[PDB]
Ligand binder design. Structure first.
Ligand SMILES: Nc1nc2c(ncn2[C@@H]2O[C@H](COP(=O)(O)OP(=O)(O)NP(=O)(O)O)[C@@H](O)[C@H]2O)c(=O)[nH]1
Ligand SMILES: O=C(O)c1ccc(Br)o1
Ligand SMILES: [Mg+2]
Ligand SMILES: [N+]
Length: 404
């Protein structure tokens, strides 16, 4: 829709939470509610978000979706994540883009295993703040149950070092708000009970999730979240720009996952299908890459200023191994354990090598060991990561030292 005009600060948010708790319905409601007060917002219905044939077939979100909305204060890109246990990988890549997450929890069900898992994982890809939306209150008459659900959620957040007692917990119905906006798309704040709860959420997002300190002077770095072919344009890599700036005509390097880095020229930069003169740190963009196909760039690589990043394969890490009560392993593991490691949008198999004398690591252990990744990836000291294996989260770590 033409050129992107920067009128206000930009923040990346998104929806996480257990399967079916109402993330996508809420995402759609946010677009409709905000669109009444700001005509730059294009509304997105439920089927515009869960749009893929496989999402229709399976009846769940599978792919992250990005939607745009804005308030008087700020412009938002919103990443809606799947809740299903089998699509955690996609959720991780989504959370890796968020400056703050909206944790959706059904009032009728309370916190559930992916409520816990998403909180834990959001932390490990750097989500700094969480707002809670307690959804489906239209289904729950009993005030006592609502208070219990809120108490449990606040306590759950405390377990993962979020300020659980301080987070806003907004109670409402994404569906009833969305219904009201369908019957009157011009419904303004103060007119409807359910719509006003969405405004309470928007207010909490505005005021509780700060605009991050970003650095546009450091070398360009954009973790790639997705890649696709646009008919008649070419290959687009999407992602949140971590730092620096990118302009059409810039040479960039595609770093990680391949034996060697390759260079390409950026031939387009857009945010929400609007042309950007310059992509800057924080922007949620699509970057058109010349001379590469969608088989030559992939999720988990990073786009970088040429020569600015050396990818790595081997590192030391401080790792907490989840207890089974946290959805972790029942039993311990040995050197040669071979799980998946998640750094930002990157997912890669790695080999655990314990010190001489450390035979075994048990659930509950805080331990240090060495990991050798099977492919090079953009890494740095202090970077947090998650460890998963066999479809479950088994560990949380931070890179302490880069060895190679
Ligand atoms: N009664 C009621 N039902 C709701 C509400 N919000 C969502 N639902 C229902 O809950 C179901 C799941 O909604 P959905 O938005 O797809 O949830 P999700 O969290 O995005 N699912 P997933 O984890 O697969 O992405 C749908 O049947 C939807 O109609 C609400 O406020 N009230
Ligand atoms: O359709 C897209 O998402 C797109 C096209 C060109 C760019 Br850059 O992003
Ligand atoms: Mg969904
Ligand atoms: N989706």
């Amino acid at each position: 829709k033409g050129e992107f005009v920067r009128t206000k600060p930009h923040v990346n948010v998104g929806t996480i939470g257990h399967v079916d708790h109402g993330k996508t319905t809420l995402t759609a409601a946010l677009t409709y509610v905000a669109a009444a007060e700001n005509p730059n917002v294009e509304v997105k219905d439920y089927g515009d978000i869960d749009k893929a044939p496989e999402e229709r077939a399976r009846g769940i979100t599978i792919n992250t979706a990005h939607v745009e909305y804005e308030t008087a204060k700020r412009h938002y890109s919103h990443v809606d994540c799947p809740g299903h246990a089998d699509y955690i990988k996609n959720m991780i890549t989504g959370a890796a883009q968020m400056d703050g997450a909206i944790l959706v929890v059904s009032a009728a069900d309370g916190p559930m295993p992916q409520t816990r898992e998403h909180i834990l994982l959001a932390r490990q890809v750097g989500v700094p703040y969480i707002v809670v939306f307690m959804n489906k209150v239209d289904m729950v008459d009993d005030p006592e149950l609502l208070d219990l659900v809120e108490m449990e959620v606040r306590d759950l957040l405390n377990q993962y070092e979020f300020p659980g007692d301080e987070v806003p917990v907004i109670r409402g119905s994404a569906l009833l708000a969305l219904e009201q906006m369908h019957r009157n798309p011009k419904t303004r704040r103060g007119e409807n009970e359910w719509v006003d709860k969405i405004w309470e959420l928007l207010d909490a997002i505005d005021e509780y999730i700060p605009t991050p300190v970003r650095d546009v002077d450091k070398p360009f770095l954009m973790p790639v979240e997705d890649v696709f072919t646009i008919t008649g344009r070419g290959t687009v890599a999407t992602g949140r720009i971590e730092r620096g700036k990118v302009k059409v005509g810039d040479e960039v390097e595609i770093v990680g996952l391949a034996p060697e880095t390759r260079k390409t020229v950026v031939t387009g930069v857009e945010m929400h299908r609007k042309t950007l003169q310059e992509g800057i740190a924080g922007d949620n963009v699509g970057v058109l890459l010349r001379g590469v196909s969608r088989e030559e760039v992939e999720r988990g690589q990073v786009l970088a200023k040429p020569g600015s990043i050396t990818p790595h394969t081997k590192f030391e890490a401080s790792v907490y191994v989840l207890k089974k009560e946290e959805g972790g392993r029942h039993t311990g593991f040995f050197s040669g354990y071979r799980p998946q490691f998640y750094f930002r949008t990157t997912d890669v198999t790695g080999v655990v090598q314990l010190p001489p004398g450390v035979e075994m690591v048990m659930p509950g252990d805080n331990v240090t060991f060495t990991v050798e990744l099977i492919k090079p990836v953009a890494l740095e000291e202090g970077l947090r990561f998650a460890i998963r294996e066999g479809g479950r989260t088994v560990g949380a770590g931070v890179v302490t030292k880069i060895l190679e």
